[PDB]
Write an enzyme that holds these catalytic residues in place. Structure first.
Site, PDB file in Angstrom:
ATOM      1  N   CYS A 149      18.136 -26.502  33.628  1.00 47.82           N
ATOM      2  CA  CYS A 149      18.107 -25.316  32.782  1.00 47.82           C
ATOM      3  C   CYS A 149      19.512 -24.814  32.481  1.00 47.82           C
ATOM      4  N   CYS A 154      17.425 -24.743  29.270  1.00 51.66           N
ATOM      5  CA  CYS A 154      17.100 -23.445  28.677  1.00 51.66           C
ATOM      6  C   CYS A 154      18.340 -22.741  28.143  1.00 51.66           C
ATOM      7  N   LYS A 157      20.268 -24.637  25.352  1.00 54.08           N
ATOM      8  CA  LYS A 157      19.251 -24.781  24.319  1.00 54.08           C
ATOM      9  C   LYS A 157      19.060 -23.474  23.563  1.00 54.08           C
ATOM     10  N   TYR A 291       8.576 -30.384  22.933  1.00 56.15           N
ATOM     11  CA  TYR A 291       9.309 -29.154  22.687  1.00 56.15           C
ATOM     12  C   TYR A 291      10.820 -29.364  22.681  1.00 56.15           C
ATOM     13  N   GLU A 295      12.885 -28.317  19.311  1.00 51.96           N
ATOM     14  CA  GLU A 295      13.921 -27.314  19.511  1.00 51.96           C
ATOM     15  C   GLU A 295      15.279 -27.847  19.081  1.00 51.96           C
ATOM     16  N   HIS A 566       5.133   0.782  16.701  1.00 52.47           N
ATOM     17  CA  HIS A 566       5.390   0.500  15.302  1.00 52.47           C
ATOM     18  C   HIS A 566       6.826   0.875  14.949  1.00 52.47           C
TER      19      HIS A 566
HETATM   20  C1  FAD Z   1      16.379 -29.524  26.916  1.00 47.56           C
HETATM   21  C2  FAD Z   1      15.565 -28.861  28.005  1.00 47.56           C
HETATM   22  C3  FAD Z   1      15.263 -27.551  27.657  1.00 47.56           C
HETATM   23  C4  FAD Z   1      14.511 -26.750  28.535  1.00 47.56           C
HETATM   24  N1  FAD Z   1      14.191 -25.336  28.145  1.00 47.56           N
HETATM   25  C5  FAD Z   1      13.417 -24.525  29.039  1.00 47.56           C
HETATM   26  C6  FAD Z   1      13.105 -23.115  28.657  1.00 47.56           C
HETATM   27  O1  FAD Z   1      13.491 -22.690  27.610  1.00 47.56           O
HETATM   28  N2  FAD Z   1      12.335 -22.294  29.555  1.00 47.56           N
HETATM   29  C7  FAD Z   1      11.863 -22.842  30.855  1.00 47.56           C
HETATM   30  O2  FAD Z   1      11.216 -22.165  31.608  1.00 47.56           O
HETATM   31  N3  FAD Z   1      12.198 -24.232  31.213  1.00 47.56           N
HETATM   32  C8  FAD Z   1      12.963 -25.055  30.306  1.00 47.56           C
HETATM   33  N4  FAD Z   1      13.269 -26.421  30.683  1.00 47.56           N
HETATM   34  C9  FAD Z   1      12.774 -26.912  31.971  1.00 47.56           C
HETATM   35  C10 FAD Z   1      13.700 -26.442  33.119  1.00 47.56           C
HETATM   36  O3  FAD Z   1      15.007 -26.887  32.893  1.00 47.56           O
HETATM   37  C11 FAD Z   1      13.142 -27.054  34.382  1.00 47.56           C
HETATM   38  O4  FAD Z   1      11.801 -26.636  34.538  1.00 47.56           O
HETATM   39  C12 FAD Z   1      13.955 -26.575  35.577  1.00 47.56           C
HETATM   40  O5  FAD Z   1      15.293 -26.999  35.444  1.00 47.56           O
HETATM   41  C13 FAD Z   1      13.352 -27.176  36.831  1.00 47.56           C
HETATM   42  O6  FAD Z   1      14.144 -26.770  38.005  1.00 47.56           O
HETATM   43  P1  FAD Z   1      14.133 -27.852  39.233  1.00 47.56           P
HETATM   44  O7  FAD Z   1      14.835 -27.333  40.407  1.00 47.56           O
HETATM   45  O8  FAD Z   1      12.754 -28.228  39.524  1.00 47.56           O
HETATM   46  O9  FAD Z   1      14.909 -29.213  38.653  1.00 47.56           O
HETATM   47  P2  FAD Z   1      16.475 -29.221  38.125  1.00 47.56           P
HETATM   48  O10 FAD Z   1      16.850 -27.951  37.431  1.00 47.56           O
HETATM   49  O11 FAD Z   1      16.602 -30.418  37.184  1.00 47.56           O
HETATM   50  O12 FAD Z   1      17.467 -29.373  39.507  1.00 47.56           O
HETATM   51  C14 FAD Z   1      17.434 -30.637  40.160  1.00 47.56           C
HETATM   52  C15 FAD Z   1      18.900 -30.861  40.747  1.00 47.56           C
HETATM   53  O13 FAD Z   1      18.861 -31.719  41.721  1.00 47.56           O
HETATM   54  C16 FAD Z   1      19.788 -32.947  41.256  1.00 47.56           C
HETATM   55  N5  FAD Z   1      19.350 -34.166  41.981  1.00 47.56           N
HETATM   56  C17 FAD Z   1      18.485 -35.154  41.615  1.00 47.56           C
HETATM   57  N6  FAD Z   1      18.415 -36.026  42.628  1.00 47.56           N
HETATM   58  C18 FAD Z   1      19.233 -35.587  43.620  1.00 47.56           C
HETATM   59  C19 FAD Z   1      19.551 -36.083  44.859  1.00 47.56           C
HETATM   60  N7  FAD Z   1      19.135 -37.272  45.598  1.00 47.56           N
HETATM   61  N8  FAD Z   1      20.401 -35.434  45.633  1.00 47.56           N
HETATM   62  C20 FAD Z   1      20.966 -34.273  45.206  1.00 47.56           C
HETATM   63  N9  FAD Z   1      20.659 -33.785  43.987  1.00 47.56           N
HETATM   64  C21 FAD Z   1      19.803 -34.437  43.205  1.00 47.56           C
HETATM   65  C22 FAD Z   1      19.654 -32.980  39.980  1.00 47.56           C
HETATM   66  O14 FAD Z   1      20.807 -33.730  39.319  1.00 47.56           O
HETATM   67  C23 FAD Z   1      19.734 -31.484  39.650  1.00 47.56           C
HETATM   68  O15 FAD Z   1      21.038 -31.012  39.721  1.00 47.56           O
HETATM   69  C24 FAD Z   1      14.061 -27.268  29.766  1.00 47.56           C
HETATM   70  C25 FAD Z   1      14.374 -28.596  30.117  1.00 47.56           C
HETATM   71  C26 FAD Z   1      15.115 -29.385  29.255  1.00 47.56           C
HETATM   72  C27 FAD Z   1      15.458 -30.898  29.683  1.00 47.56           C
HETATM   73  C1  FAD Z   2      12.513   9.448  10.329  1.00 50.08           C
HETATM   74  C2  FAD Z   2      11.142   9.297  10.951  1.00 50.08           C
HETATM   75  C3  FAD Z   2      11.042   8.082  11.614  1.00 50.08           C
HETATM   76  C4  FAD Z   2       9.843   7.737  12.265  1.00 50.08           C
HETATM   77  N1  FAD Z   2       9.749   6.421  12.979  1.00 50.08           N
HETATM   78  C5  FAD Z   2       8.528   6.077  13.648  1.00 50.08           C
HETATM   79  C6  FAD Z   2       8.429   4.763  14.353  1.00 50.08           C
HETATM   80  O1  FAD Z   2       9.369   4.028  14.360  1.00 50.08           O
HETATM   81  N2  FAD Z   2       7.202   4.410  15.018  1.00 50.08           N
HETATM   82  C7  FAD Z   2       6.042   5.340  14.998  1.00 50.08           C
HETATM   83  O2  FAD Z   2       5.016   5.056  15.555  1.00 50.08           O
HETATM   84  N3  FAD Z   2       6.163   6.624  14.283  1.00 50.08           N
HETATM   85  C8  FAD Z   2       7.397   6.979  13.623  1.00 50.08           C
HETATM   86  N4  FAD Z   2       7.487   8.252  12.936  1.00 50.08           N
HETATM   87  C9  FAD Z   2       6.318   9.133  12.952  1.00 50.08           C
HETATM   88  C10 FAD Z   2       5.292   8.686  11.883  1.00 50.08           C
HETATM   89  O3  FAD Z   2       5.888   8.685  10.617  1.00 50.08           O
HETATM   90  C11 FAD Z   2       4.166   9.692  11.938  1.00 50.08           C
HETATM   91  O4  FAD Z   2       3.636   9.713  13.247  1.00 50.08           O
HETATM   92  C12 FAD Z   2       3.071   9.280  10.964  1.00 50.08           C
HETATM   93  O5  FAD Z   2       3.580   9.270   9.649  1.00 50.08           O
HETATM   94  C13 FAD Z   2       1.943  10.286  11.066  1.00 50.08           C
HETATM   95  O6  FAD Z   2       0.884   9.942  10.102  1.00 50.08           O
HETATM   96  P1  FAD Z   2       0.032  11.226   9.549  1.00 50.08           P
HETATM   97  O7  FAD Z   2      -1.077  10.803   8.694  1.00 50.08           O
HETATM   98  O8  FAD Z   2      -0.410  12.029  10.685  1.00 50.08           O
HETATM   99  O9  FAD Z   2       1.113  12.153   8.675  1.00 50.08           O
HETATM  100  P2  FAD Z   2       1.921  11.604   7.342  1.00 50.08           P
HETATM  101  O10 FAD Z   2       2.291  10.159   7.452  1.00 50.08           O
HETATM  102  O11 FAD Z   2       3.167  12.480   7.209  1.00 50.08           O
HETATM  103  O12 FAD Z   2       0.863  11.772   6.012  1.00 50.08           O
HETATM  104  C14 FAD Z   2       0.599  13.106   5.592  1.00 50.08           C
HETATM  105  C15 FAD Z   2       0.401  13.032   4.012  1.00 50.08           C
HETATM  106  O13 FAD Z   2      -0.280  14.059   3.602  1.00 50.08           O
HETATM  107  C16 FAD Z   2       0.685  14.843   2.584  1.00 50.08           C
HETATM  108  N5  FAD Z   2       0.261  16.265   2.536  1.00 50.08           N
HETATM  109  C17 FAD Z   2       0.709  17.350   3.227  1.00 50.08           C
HETATM  110  N6  FAD Z   2      -0.011  18.408   2.833  1.00 50.08           N
HETATM  111  C18 FAD Z   2      -0.903  17.986   1.899  1.00 50.08           C
HETATM  112  C19 FAD Z   2      -1.864  18.633   1.164  1.00 50.08           C
HETATM  113  N7  FAD Z   2      -2.307  20.023   1.098  1.00 50.08           N
HETATM  114  N8  FAD Z   2      -2.604  17.958   0.304  1.00 50.08           N
HETATM  115  C20 FAD Z   2      -2.417  16.621   0.142  1.00 50.08           C
HETATM  116  N9  FAD Z   2      -1.471  15.983   0.860  1.00 50.08           N
HETATM  117  C21 FAD Z   2      -0.723  16.661   1.727  1.00 50.08           C
HETATM  118  C22 FAD Z   2       1.867  14.631   3.040  1.00 50.08           C
HETATM  119  O14 FAD Z   2       2.926  14.863   1.967  1.00 50.08           O
HETATM  120  C23 FAD Z   2       1.773  13.138   3.381  1.00 50.08           C
HETATM  121  O15 FAD Z   2       1.832  12.348   2.242  1.00 50.08           O
HETATM  122  C24 FAD Z   2       8.743   8.618  12.248  1.00 50.08           C
HETATM  123  C25 FAD Z   2       8.849   9.848  11.570  1.00 50.08           C
HETATM  124  C26 FAD Z   2      10.027  10.187  10.927  1.00 50.08           C
HETATM  125  C27 FAD Z   2      10.118  11.599  10.160  1.00 50.08           C
HETATM  126  O1  E1T Z   3       4.752 -28.527  32.003  1.00 44.16           O
HETATM  127  C1  E1T Z   3       4.428 -27.898  31.012  1.00 44.16           C
HETATM  128  O2  E1T Z   3       3.147 -27.695  30.728  1.00 44.16           O
HETATM  129  C2  E1T Z   3       5.476 -27.343  30.107  1.00 44.16           C
HETATM  130  C3  E1T Z   3       6.814 -27.562  30.413  1.00 44.16           C
HETATM  131  C4  E1T Z   3       7.789 -27.048  29.573  1.00 44.16           C
HETATM  132  C5  E1T Z   3       7.401 -26.331  28.448  1.00 44.16           C
HETATM  133  C6  E1T Z   3       8.360 -25.803  27.594  1.00 44.16           C
HETATM  134  C7  E1T Z   3       7.941 -25.092  26.479  1.00 44.16           C
HETATM  135  C8  E1T Z   3       6.580 -24.928  26.242  1.00 44.16           C
HETATM  136  N1  E1T Z   3       5.670 -25.432  27.083  1.00 44.16           N
HETATM  137  C9  E1T Z   3       6.049 -26.132  28.178  1.00 44.16           C
HETATM  138  N2  E1T Z   3       5.111 -26.640  29.010  1.00 44.16           N
END
Ligand code: FAD
Ligand code: FAD
Ligand code: E1T
Ligand code: 250
Ligand code: 250
Ligand code: E1T
Ligand code: NA
Ligand code: NA
Lengths: 587, 587
Positions: A149, A154, A157, A291, A295, A566
């Site tokens: 990894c 990981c 990657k 994968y 990737e 939202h």
């Molecule tokens: C390209 C690639 C991308 C991946 N991306 C992800 C990801 O995004 N998310 C995720 O969860 N997993 C990912 N994996 C999987 C993840 O890397 C493995 O699941 C993880 O490394 C397993 O850990 P491990 O200890 O079991 O083996 P390893 O991490 O491989 O460690 C084994 C170590 O022991 C060494 N070794 C081997 N034999 C001996 C020996 N006799 N004596 C001493 N040392 C030895 C090895 O050289 C190595 O250093 C990816 C794998 C690859 C190949």
């Molecule tokens: C800058 C800002 C950012 C926000 N960001 C988020 C966010 O990221 N995530 C989130 O979950 N919420 C966010 N909110 C809150 C969200 O906008 C409100 O919770 C949501 O709009 C409420 O819906 P509502 O129907 O209760 O009121 P409103 O959406 O305000 O609808 C009321 C409508 O009725 C109109 N009205 C008023 N009086 C009358 C009347 N007598 N007759 C007819 N129409 C009338 C109004 O003009 C309006 O058109 C944000 C609010 C603001 C001000």
């Molecule tokens: O062993 C598995 O099942 C396994 C291993 C590695 C994965 C990486 C990305 C998505 N799925 C995966 N699944």
């Protein structure tokens, strides 16, 4: 059977102290161990729903029924007075260091699991050694401590995934008002690699420091298990010696497979080489369809590469195939070419890798499509990503008696124990487990706790969540739709789904109805969510939290009564209403 | 009390059909209604864990005990034969259209809740009217259908948040190998606004179409509730008429507050004006310290604006204050200046808004810090974001009897019913509810279902998750640390926390130990997760899924036995181990 838990705990623990929370005499022992920096597990019978039975059964070992009782490696050491004595007499250091073996734990493998297990073990007094050796790739690629990894997985990657995504961020910044022409921006591969490698280098360093700071012995040596308690190590100077350990953790991971065809080993590369490659791959053929293949093809394409993927059969074997097609369709529609139903036959070299100007060689790939047509194309780099395989003949002599499956992976019990009792296997080599870094970490740390701290919690390998970091990420937790249908029948499976569009894709003028998510539910189990699937940006972040709910037995109703945040992609899961059986459009 | 549920359902439903899943005669009625495009609720007694009691109690209304039974507005219509008859006699259209009132539902307010409720209601036969009017701001700003979120809220807010974030994406692309000089890239405000407004314009359009396609009557008119069942509408031409409805949903939302100080209304603006502002605000003073103030200051700063925030007391009153300080510290460290403990006294105009070249005016802000110093500074734009207040004197005559709290918000029961029985309130005007778009949507759609489809599911306003889209986003679900401590006592609250660093911030060389997350847990309830808090990128996506687990009663152990997805920010929640009571560093 509290008796048996105590027998196992006392036996394997290196230094363990039985105690109660509010206890005068116990705290007198703790304070002494702290001052002398003696690391130890601590069981608070006070805080255990069966500690009364344990405190008595304890006299099976100490002849004593009162706390504090300290044990060293299966051996009672004494009550308060006997410990305070050893200390005052300056013999307590030698008492806790007595051991038949050089180490309480030898971890063979310095990767995700091995480091995790080894670090956790030393936390509880285990005299621990971590062994790591990176056998070079055919072209000489090697790297430092940390595992697949950290070094070739990981971490690099995702960083190269991220560099890829910025391609789309640079396109989008224009629509959002930023004054840059995407057309006039190039990407330098070497600068990216140097930064990725600098970070990997700091991780290599960080783990070495972590092991030093936890009195863990780090040996850069190939370990070989020759007997249950003996590990043979070959160091850099070819010097062979032998070390002994009570418990052994195998964590040697896997390495890439090469198809047995001419020129593959000689002229192609794998993931192991890609992430430190000194030159941009250029026109690249990725051979493989799971994968890693997708990737790597994804970010190479997003970094301006002419990228082809050779697919023998299907994409992402074992994944929800509807998602896999959606994954592939997005890549096909964003550069990556797919050579479907196609197998290579040989790799001829046309140019050697220019080490002077850091430029890729040139290769001729001879293959055949399944419809008879001959595949013959030139590529600068050919990457094999056709699977990974364990390397345990180099780690074991079958002498020892560690049973391996047909795929060469260690066969374990649900506590990672091998057919040899003191020997455990974690990570990719543990047969049938998901091959993922946090799985290996959890298995390692939880195993370490059971051995040297009396824990009982096993690792739960069920419904482990995942994310394929293709250009359009795909997160999943649970069963594919086809698996759930197969496991319970079409009639017992309801599938809620919806397309969606990131708000960020609106001003950016990206696609409608490309991103997509679905819950795969079981009708006859209160609409239990069996699998969750999301294709969209940051699918990792989206999916993670739901993996907690699914582990808890979340139903469709549990999703519906949660309120969305939202605006987010993830909120689309709290309002899913269109089913598949209904035929209504998910747009 | 199944009797009472049936009494309420039959009374308020517009067209409802009682039926069984496998039923010959019922499907004969469904097929007829479908052909005639007659929308209706449908209760399957077959699928109800008390349908036997209902089918009998049903004879309280129909004199009949067999399905299918069709009702129109509290009035039995007949069995199969009686319906097939009405249809064949071509009188079925008139039967389902009979009504004392013009509408089964009048929604006053065309925003998040109002549109959601109105659309869901028509789904089940409700003859529905949606009223929306946008009173202009002091400077004339107005907009189309959709509500606060669509037009001057979540949607434009997040899009401008996103445009801001791209600032950091452009900086990062260099470290990841892309050949662009961040120094030589500017941002054009007008281009961004035009794209945001184009998308809002398509949403304005999309809702109008959605209402047309669902036979919902959309009136662009100010609604006034003059009697429980009578709504007075003033259209664009000042023409006053009156419409009648059985059920009334108040969903009029709120509008920004202005502090009562000279020049504020005349020379400053609010969120309502910012998101369509034809000119870049320029040197900007944001007056206020909750989530609108900091979100707007955040992206204005990231878009190259000289931005100051005036804080009377504290940031984000009512939020976890540790997070709020972390939020503010990140903004302070990335441009935004904070004028702490400072209240304005007057706004003098120095330049008029140049409508010619689209350039901001110029303003003198006279204030005073609390330590006596006089605040006197020039700003091109002053934005008030000091709160929002309902406008219900314009919507009600207290004649009608809708009880309002001291803050002017409608006091409702847990089913959104007002003190007038046919009148309901959803969204921001519903006293004590979280003022969020998905909350208003859920309340609206669930309310619509109870009225016209016999649903019983109430909306669950507890543990509603949220995200402050400041430059560094802050997601939360549940109690702040201080609230949990206050509600149960320091001794009963354990807080697990950890800093973290997005993998993307490593090559980008952004900060260590800035991002941060914590679980606030109750020791005496199995370490139940009471609140979840994450400061980091994409905090919306991170938090959402966990809101499902928390609604399900997730504990710390439920998090620990979930396996992380690697590499993600969110996975840090599956491995939290450092507590606050221990004093160990979360780095
Ligand atoms: C390209 C690639 C991308 C991946 N991306 C992800 C990801 O995004 N998310 C995720 O969860 N997993 C990912 N994996 C999987 C993840 O890397 C493995 O699941 C993880 O490394 C397993 O850990 P491990 O200890 O079991 O083996 P390893 O991490 O491989 O460690 C084994 C170590 O022991 C060494 N070794 C081997 N034999 C001996 C020996 N006799 N004596 C001493 N040392 C030895 C090895 O050289 C190595 O250093 C990816 C794998 C690859 C190949
Ligand atoms: C800058 C800002 C950012 C926000 N960001 C988020 C966010 O990221 N995530 C989130 O979950 N919420 C966010 N909110 C809150 C969200 O906008 C409100 O919770 C949501 O709009 C409420 O819906 P509502 O129907 O209760 O009121 P409103 O959406 O305000 O609808 C009321 C409508 O009725 C109109 N009205 C008023 N009086 C009358 C009347 N007598 N007759 C007819 N129409 C009338 C109004 O003009 C309006 O058109 C944000 C609010 C603001 C001000
Ligand atoms: O062993 C598995 O099942 C396994 C291993 C590695 C994965 C990486 C990305 C998505 N799925 C995966 N699944
Ligand atoms: O519980 S399951 O065995 O059903 C799933 C595992 O917990 C984790 N998965 C991750 C993805 N893998 C293949 C792609 O789905 C299989 C194992
Ligand atoms: O259940 S609670 O009333 O504790 C919380 C609500 O469900 C939603 N919150 C969102 C954030 N709000 C203020 C900032 O925390 C309060 C209401
Ligand atoms: O009414 C509330 O409690 C409320 C309303 C809006 C919010 C927006 C972002 C974060 N928290 C919020 N809380
Ligand atoms: Na491996
Ligand atoms: Na509002």
């Amino acid at each position: 059977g509290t008796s048996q838990w105590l027998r196992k705990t006392v036996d394997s623990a290196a230094v363990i102290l039985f105690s109660k929370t509010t206890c005068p005499y116990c705290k007198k022992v703790k304070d002494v161990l702290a001052e002398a920096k003696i690391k130890h597990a601590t069981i608070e019978l006070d805080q255990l729903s069966n500690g009364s039975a344990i405190q008595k059964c304890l006299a099976s070992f100490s002849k004593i029924e009162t706390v504090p009782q300290m044990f060293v490696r299966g051996k009672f050491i004494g009550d308060s007075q006997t410990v305070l004595k050893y200390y005052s007499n300056d013999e307590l250091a030698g008492i806790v260091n007595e051991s038949k073996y050089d180490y309480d734990l030898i971890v063979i493998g310095g990767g995700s699991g091995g480091l995790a297990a080894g670090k956790e073990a030393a936390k509880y007094g285990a005299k621990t050694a971590v062994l790591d050796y990176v056998e070079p790739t055919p072209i000489g690629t090697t790297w430092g401590l940390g595992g697949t990894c950290v070094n070739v997985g990981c971490i690099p990657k995702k960083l190269m995934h991220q560099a890829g995504l910025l391609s789309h961020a640079l396109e989008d910044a224009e629509h959002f008002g930023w004054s840059l022409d995407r057309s006039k921006i190039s990407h330098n591969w070497s600068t990216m690699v140097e930064g990725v490698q600098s970070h990997i280098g700091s991780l290599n360093w960080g783990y070495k420091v972590a092991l030093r700071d936890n009195q863990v012995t780090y040996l850069n040596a190939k370990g070989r298990l020759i007997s249950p308690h003996e590990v043979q190590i070959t160091d850099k100077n070819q010097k062979v010696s032998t070390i002994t350990g009570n418990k052994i953790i195998l964590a040697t991971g896997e390495r890439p497979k090469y198809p047995e065809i001419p020129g593959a080993v000689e002229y192609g590369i794998t993931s192991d080489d890609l992430f430190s490659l000194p030159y941009f791959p250029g026109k690249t053929l990725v051979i493989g369809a799971s994968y890693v293949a997708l990737e790597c093809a994804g970010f190479l394409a997003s970094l301006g590469g002419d990228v082809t993927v050779m697919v023998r059969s299907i994409l992402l074997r074992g994944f929800d195939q509807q998602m896999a097609e959606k994954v592939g369709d997005y890549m096909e529609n964003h550069g990556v070419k797919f050579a479907k139903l196609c197998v290579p036959d040989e790799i001829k070299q046309l140019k050697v890798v220019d080490t002077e100007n850091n430029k890729p060689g040139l290769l001729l790939v001879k293959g055949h499509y399944t419809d008879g047509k001959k595949f013959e194309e030139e590529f600068e780099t050919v990457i094999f990503a056709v699977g990974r395989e364990p390397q345990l003949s180099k780690v074991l002599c079958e002498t020892v008696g560690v049973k391996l499956d047909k795929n060469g992976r260690v066969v374990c019990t649900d506590d990672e124990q091998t057919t040899v009792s003191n020997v455990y296997a974690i990570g990719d080599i543990n047969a049938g487990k998901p091959q993922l870094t946090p799985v290996a970490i959890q298995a390692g740390r939880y195993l370490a706790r059971r051995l040297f701290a009396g824990a009982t919690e096993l690792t739960d390998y069920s419904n482990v969540a995942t994310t394929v970091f293709t250009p359009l990420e795909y997160g999943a937790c649970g069963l594919s739709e086809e698996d759930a249908i197969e496991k319970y029948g079409d009639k017992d499976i309801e599938v809620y789904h919806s397309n969606f569009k990131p708000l960020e894709w609106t001003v950016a003028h990206r696609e409608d109805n490309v991103c997509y998510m679905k819950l795969v539910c079981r009708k006859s189990d209160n609409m239990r969510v069996l699998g969750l699937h999301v294709l969209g940006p940051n699918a990792g972040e989206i999916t993670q939290g739901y993996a907690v709910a699914i582990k808890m037995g979340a139903t469709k109703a549990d999703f519906d009564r949660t309120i969305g945040i939202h605006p987010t992609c993830s909120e689309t899961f709290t309002t899913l209403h269109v089913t598949k059986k209904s035929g209504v459009s998910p747009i």
